[PDB]
Amino acid sequence: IRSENITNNAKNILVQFNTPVQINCTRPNNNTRKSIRIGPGQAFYATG
Amino acid sequence: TLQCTNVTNNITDDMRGELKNCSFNMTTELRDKKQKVYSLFYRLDVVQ
Amino acid sequence: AENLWVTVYYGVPVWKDAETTLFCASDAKAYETEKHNVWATHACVPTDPNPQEIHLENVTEEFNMWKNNMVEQMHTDIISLWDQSLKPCVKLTPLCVTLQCTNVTNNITDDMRGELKNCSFNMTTELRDKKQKVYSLFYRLDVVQINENKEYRLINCNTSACTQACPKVSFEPIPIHYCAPAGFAILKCKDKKFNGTGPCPSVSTVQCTHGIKPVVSTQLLLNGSLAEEEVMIRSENITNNAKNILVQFNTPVQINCTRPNNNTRKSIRIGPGQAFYATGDIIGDIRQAHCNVSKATWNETLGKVVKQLRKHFGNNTIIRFANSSGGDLEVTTHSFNCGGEFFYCNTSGLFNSTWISNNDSITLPCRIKQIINMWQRIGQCMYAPPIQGVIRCVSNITGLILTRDGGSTNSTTETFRPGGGDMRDNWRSELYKYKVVKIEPLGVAPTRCKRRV
Amino acid sequence: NPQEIHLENVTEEFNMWKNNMVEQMHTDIISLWDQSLKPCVKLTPLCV
Amino acid sequence: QVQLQESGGGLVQPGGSLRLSCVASGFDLENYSIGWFRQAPGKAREGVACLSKNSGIGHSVKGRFTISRDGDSNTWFLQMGALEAEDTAVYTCATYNRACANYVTIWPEFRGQGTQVT
Amino acid sequence: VFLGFLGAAGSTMGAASMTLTVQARNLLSGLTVWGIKQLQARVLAVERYLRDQQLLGIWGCSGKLICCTNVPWNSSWSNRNLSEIWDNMTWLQWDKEISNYTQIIYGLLEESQNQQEKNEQDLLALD
Amino acid sequence: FLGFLGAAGSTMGAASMTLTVQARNLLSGLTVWGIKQLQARVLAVERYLRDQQLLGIWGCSGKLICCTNVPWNSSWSNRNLSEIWDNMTWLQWDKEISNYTQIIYGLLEESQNQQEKNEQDLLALD
Amino acid sequence: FLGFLGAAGSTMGAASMTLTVQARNLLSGLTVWGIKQLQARVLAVERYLRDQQLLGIWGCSGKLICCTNVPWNSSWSNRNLSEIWDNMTWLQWDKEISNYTQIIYGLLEESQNQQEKNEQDLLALD
Ligand SMILES: *[C@@H]1O[C@H](CO)[C@@H](O[C@@H]2O[C@H](CO)[C@@H](O[C@@H]3O[C@H](CO)[C@@H](O)[C@H](O)[C@@H]3O)[C@H](O)[C@H]2NC(C)=O)[C@H](O)[C@H]1NC(C)=O
Ligand SMILES: *[C@@H]1O[C@H](CO)[C@@H](O[C@@H]2O[C@H](CO)[C@@H](O[C@@H]3O[C@H](CO)[C@@H](O)[C@H](O)[C@@H]3O)[C@H](O)[C@H]2NC(C)=O)[C@H](O)[C@H]1NC(C)=O
Ligand SMILES: *[C@@H]1O[C@H](CO)[C@@H](O[C@@H]2O[C@H](CO)[C@@H](O)[C@H](O)[C@H]2NC(C)=O)[C@H](O)[C@H]1NC(C)=O
Ligand SMILES: *[C@@H]1O[C@H](CO)[C@@H](O[C@@H]2O[C@H](CO)[C@@H](O)[C@H](O)[C@H]2NC(C)=O)[C@H](O)[C@H]1NC(C)=O
Ligand SMILES: *[C@@H]1O[C@H](CO)[C@@H](O[C@@H]2O[C@H](CO)[C@@H](O)[C@H](O)[C@H]2NC(C)=O)[C@H](O)[C@H]1NC(C)=O
Ligand SMILES: *[C@@H]1O[C@H](CO)[C@@H](O[C@@H]2O[C@H](CO)[C@@H](O)[C@H](O)[C@H]2NC(C)=O)[C@H](O)[C@H]1NC(C)=O
Ligand SMILES: *[C@@H]1O[C@H](CO)[C@@H](O[C@@H]2O[C@H](CO)[C@@H](O)[C@H](O)[C@H]2NC(C)=O)[C@H](O)[C@H]1NC(C)=O
Ligand SMILES: *[C@@H]1O[C@H](CO)[C@@H](O)[C@H](O)[C@H]1NC(C)=O
Ligand SMILES: *[C@@H]1O[C@H](CO)[C@@H](O)[C@H](O)[C@H]1NC(C)=O
Ligand SMILES: *[C@@H]1O[C@H](CO)[C@@H](O)[C@H](O)[C@H]1NC(C)=O
Ligand SMILES: *[C@@H]1O[C@H](CO)[C@@H](O)[C@H](O)[C@H]1NC(C)=O
Ligand SMILES: *[C@@H]1O[C@H](CO)[C@@H](O)[C@H](O)[C@H]1NC(C)=O
Ligand SMILES: *[C@@H]1O[C@H](CO)[C@@H](O)[C@H](O)[C@H]1NC(C)=O
Ligand SMILES: *[C@@H]1O[C@H](CO)[C@@H](O)[C@H](O)[C@H]1NC(C)=O
Ligand SMILES: *[C@@H]1O[C@H](CO)[C@@H](O)[C@H](O)[C@H]1NC(C)=O
Ligand SMILES: *[C@@H]1O[C@H](CO)[C@@H](O)[C@H](O)[C@H]1NC(C)=O
Ligand SMILES: *[C@@H]1O[C@H](CO)[C@@H](O)[C@H](O)[C@H]1NC(C)=O
Ligand SMILES: *[C@@H]1O[C@H](CO)[C@@H](O)[C@H](O)[C@H]1NC(C)=O
Ligand SMILES: *[C@@H]1O[C@H](CO)[C@@H](O)[C@H](O)[C@H]1NC(C)=O
Ligand SMILES: *[C@@H]1O[C@H](CO)[C@@H](O)[C@H](O)[C@H]1NC(C)=O
Ligand SMILES: *[C@@H]1O[C@H](CO)[C@@H](O)[C@H](O)[C@H]1NC(C)=O
Ligand SMILES: *[C@@H]1O[C@H](CO)[C@@H](O)[C@H](O)[C@H]1NC(C)=O
Ligand SMILES: *[C@@H]1O[C@H](CO)[C@@H](O)[C@H](O)[C@H]1NC(C)=O
């Protein structure tokens, strides 16, 4: 437990762990990206 | 401006709204012509 | 006497192969009545008034030209200079409008049928809202037909945006000398039998390299440096098809190249401050640009090249030439940089001959192109502004980048076809006899010294 | 508190019309203004 | 690794289309370009397509044949249509010079094995 | 005479070790391209010269050209006669001959100089 | 051996044994890490050059141990000799004298100037 | 007197008093004023290092006040020593050798080379 002033209400308390916590997460969706033309040369990819 | 409408294909109750099925005009490679392109925009990136 | 003890010597003549970065050395010419340059020499340090070359003896230094880093450094430097010079002036994106172009028949000649096109289009004036109907002349190579009076469009206008070549600057090649910094030495080979990979027992140190012109050409090197004695053949394998053969001539071949049409440049406003220079209203007759070589000189030069080339392929082998068989418009054709106008010539009147064991002129047609893609990295096109008047160019064309054909097992049907590709052989023919050595002055040696306390 | 060593017995030939500071500063101020005018508005659309 | 692996060969009825493809790796496919062969019995070697780097242009010897690429995927697609009786041969995909130097005539290095199109 | 940078780079070490000043004097010669590009080379040259000079100064050395030293030759790095070494071999051949055993030599020179300084301190303090 | 800065906590006498190794790596060595890395290199060069000039015009240039004049004024440290060298560390010594080590850098200069005076006069006399 | 470059008006003999003073301030220490400053720093370091190398080429190694061979040729100056050391200022003196320095800077070099060769021969023959 680390803090600049542990007796203060506006200082973050940077807790550092001893064992990691495994976290997964996904975006369970295909995202088909289609390219369209901004103008001459420039292109812009938007999810289709 | 985005003539956007709200997406209702194979959607889930938790993800209501959110994705929006936006259609807007866009300059083509020639800087004299307007296309009509479409994209998907999350509700966090579009305001009314 | 036994006390053979180690002593240390500083500033000893010992070198080790290494790599570093060099800089400019250009002739000053007082650099006062100058209109700038694309390789800006105002920031380049001035060359020595009398560079000194020190001949070394007893020395056999290994040389190699195909894994030399000087060529890569040169290429990066010139590309960076080209990119830097194109920033601080017009950036014409508003030219992809739908051009309406017809033919031109103001007493045209049949060989140049089509080619030049009368294009007209809407264009924004100085004001952001008002529009004007302007016209220009666009070559057939720079316009494509959309919506297949037809509607044409600039060829670069779906894939890149062109910054018009800066009207004040010039592309005229000037010599530049690459001088190594302190602590590094430039070794130059003076052997006339030098061919590339192999030691050269005549190496001499120089302050830095001689004047070299960063010319841009394909399949026919122009204003190169000739090798004396005889025409020399260099490669990285003479027995591999996919490797070029940087043939270097010993007798320069004169080549003239013209453009017998006037070009009334007419600047037109396309926005606030920005002005775009265009062609229009060719005065007099219109005829396609051409190039002249001398058949008497070229036939003899090809004979000499064949005689020197049969050494590596046997004295009973046929040797045929042919033109390029396909590729881009910058490899199957000559790729001049003549006075700000980028020619593209028909080098098929030269490479058409067959050689066996045992006054006039050749005219190559040329196709002027304005919209170019030199330094072929995609998305860096540039529009070369038209140049008024009739132009002429003279060169010695001392070089050749032929590629072998091969592949038909073992037989005598060898054919050579010109072909460029990577833009590095126009300098690999100029920095072949050069290397950079890092001097290591520290060195220990045993003597009878005792180091008095 | 910058130091100012007064020197005696010394004569020096000055020159105000061939000074280099008066030119280096002239270029430097232009460089300053060109640098300070870059990172904000570059209004083109006032030509209507 | 540099060797090329081809796929899509087979039998085609006159008047159809194919999707010849070939893929490769070898930490050196940024300096080379990829084109295709054509070798019919009794005749020499020709070329059919060459996707030139440094220009992105899809040069081909005939109008029907077209070369194409997709993203950073190291696969090249030769699309051929309106096939006719002569187009029965051994199609090989090989590597040509960085700017598609002389082809339809050259014999390159780092070549493939070649499928069969009848 | 036979002046010029690396003028005697092929001559034997006997005559080469007369004009080391020529090889050592020009070690300090002198946003756009040719701008910071030249300055980087200048800084690198200064770095290399400073490395060499400090390496000379760390040992008991830096008179200038020649500097006799302690820690006898191990006689294993080169089993060659003195006359042959000093009049029959050019400097680059010597470099490639003894380029494998340099770091140990430098460490030995450093330790010898430090021991010499300690001996000097001991012989100066007591009196 | 004890590496660079290895003898930092060792006693003063033993710390004055590996000066060379810690005096050997004082010169090790556009976009980010461009002009700024070169700035770091130039700063290191300037610092080393200033230190060498100080080890110079003082009268030394042999580096490492260097005998010199200007006898030790008692006001700077009224302590024994051995206690400085057996049970003290260089960091503690630097804390002990931090404001005193600015007049010393002038006493050494004046001693060097007077020594050069004496040497020059005695050499030119004969 | 005192201060950096504070004795340029004093006599030649008296001005050889603050050599350390003038030697100390030879090493004082993207965007505008951000590349000019670094260029100036590099130039100053290079100038000082070249000057130090030139000094060390001849055998001085101690900078301030050096003794050397190559006796004073009467062509360079024809006048009494006390007149040189008692009335001139250094700037006035530099006028007399504005063009004679190039030969001296090589004469001292060859004298140093001769002395080094004699030292090496004497140590080798023993
Ligand atoms: C290979 O080298 C030759 C020789 O320098 C190059 O020819 C040179 O081309 C330039 C461009 O036109 C000529 O400069 C022009 O000269 C005319 C007439 O004096 C002048 O009115 C123009 O303002 C411009 O200065 C130059 O004279 C000409 N060299 C000679 C000797 O006539 C050639 O361009 C080089 N090859 C390539 C591919 O660049
Ligand atoms: C580069 O140069 C070669 C040099 O031959 C050009 O090849 C020639 O191109 C013409 C284009 O019309 C070919 O057609 C011929 O036209 C004449 C006109 O009457 C006709 O009589 C012939 O029967 C023939 O159809 C010609 O066959 C071809 N070869 C020769 C030897 O003339 C080439 O077009 C130039 N350009 C390029 C991009 O290669
Ligand atoms: C794209 O441009 C077309 C150009 O006509 C727009 O179509 C007009 O839209 C307005 C409302 O915004 C209508 O009042 C007009 O009647 C429409 N004209 C025609 C010919 O359809 C269109 O709205 C623009 N935006 C989009 C998303 O299509
Ligand atoms: C330049 O702008 C004018 C705008 O008036 C274009 O005029 C049009 O021309 C076509 C045929 O040429 C007519 O069918 C249209 O009715 C015209 N527009 C009008 C009258 O508003 C002209 O074509 C433009 N020039 C080009 C595209 O080259
Ligand atoms: C030069 O080319 C030769 C052949 O053109 C190269 O040697 C070939 O290496 C490949 C590598 O797989 C072998 O399959 C061939 O059989 C080899 N050729 C022969 C004739 O044996 C060679 O590597 C190239 N480079 C050099 C320096 O020679
Ligand atoms: C190219 O097109 C321009 C534009 O139409 C032509 O210029 C016209 O010429 C006719 C007479 O031939 C005049 O009546 C028009 O007023 C001109 N228009 C403009 C805008 O100047 C030109 O003649 C065509 N040909 C060439 C070679 O430029
Ligand atoms: C090389 O030369 C050959 C003929 O010598 C050219 O082949 C001709 O090309 C034109 C246009 O491409 C065709 O119209 C002819 O039918 C072709 N004739 C033959 C016999 O092939 C070839 O185009 C030339 N290539 C280059 C790059 O110049
Ligand atoms: C860290 O430990 C010291 C030990 O005395 C203590 O004084 C200090 O407050 C601590 N800091 C924290 C807990 O953030
Ligand atoms: C830490 O917090 C206490 C809480 O009142 C406060 O009195 C003290 O001044 C703070 N000290 C610092 C260094 O922030
Ligand atoms: C997403 O689509 C691809 C083909 O477009 C398919 O291979 C993949 O299985 C799809 N994603 C999931 C989670 O099934
Ligand atoms: C789409 O559905 C959400 C769900 O409540 C609704 O709030 C939103 O207004 C809808 N979008 C439109 C354009 O009506
Ligand atoms: C006009 O130019 C086109 C080029 O696209 C050409 O096909 C056509 O023959 C030309 N017309 C005339 C009359 O020359
Ligand atoms: C667009 O540019 C490409 C080059 O990538 C070219 O192949 C094509 O013909 C151009 N025009 C189109 C796609 O309409
Ligand atoms: C260059 O000449 C040397 C001479 O022995 C030869 O070994 C080498 O193969 C040659 N390189 C070529 C011809 O590319
Ligand atoms: C180009 O125009 C000038 C000016 O009228 C004229 O003197 C010259 O003859 C023209 N060019 C040609 C090739 O006639
Ligand atoms: C090139 O040769 C042709 C052949 O007739 C000639 O008409 C033309 O004037 C020549 N061009 C020159 C010499 O510049
Ligand atoms: C090229 O032009 C020059 C100058 O007009 C002439 O001296 C030379 O003969 C020409 N070369 C050829 C091959 O016609
Ligand atoms: C000139 O070129 C032809 C082309 O084949 C060749 O046969 C001939 O030997 C060459 N030399 C002469 C003098 O004609
Ligand atoms: C090419 O050479 C052949 C025979 O060598 C000849 O018949 C033909 O006319 C030549 N063509 C050209 C364009 O030189
Ligand atoms: C071209 O060749 C001639 C022939 O002597 C030579 O004088 C000239 O320097 C060469 N180069 C150029 C650019 O003219
Ligand atoms: C080259 O080596 C020979 C071998 O004896 C020698 O005589 C000659 O002087 C050397 N050349 C020099 C040192 O320039
Ligand atoms: C030192 O160089 C290489 C490095 O491994 C070694 O193989 C060689 O034997 C050594 N040199 C000698 C002369 O043994
Ligand atoms: C640290 O101090 C202890 C005595 O307090 C001593 O034994 C030890 O040697 C010291 N550490 C080192 C590295 O000398």
Ligand SMILES: *[C@@H]1O[C@H](CO)[C@@H](O)[C@H](O)[C@H]1NC(C)=O
């Ligand atoms: C200037 O010269 C006078 C004698 O003429 C001398 O007394 C004085 O000290 C000199 N000035 C300085 C600053 O030394």
